[PDB]
Amino acid sequence: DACEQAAIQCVESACESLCTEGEDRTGCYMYIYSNCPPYV
Incomplete structure (x- = not known):
């Protein structure tokens, strides 16, 4: 879904x-x- 995909793009907002x-x-x-x- 969109949520998962946003996470994987690294866009917290x-x-x-x-x-x-x-x-x-x-x-x-x-x-x-x-x-x-920069967490990794």
Whole structure:
């Protein structure tokens, strides 16, 4: 879905608009922190 795809592009700002509140949004930030520059 759009949420997952935003996470994989490393665009945190899009987690808010493309992911549901709660777990989905948290999971988008956690992915970014785990796998995107400059976190890696």
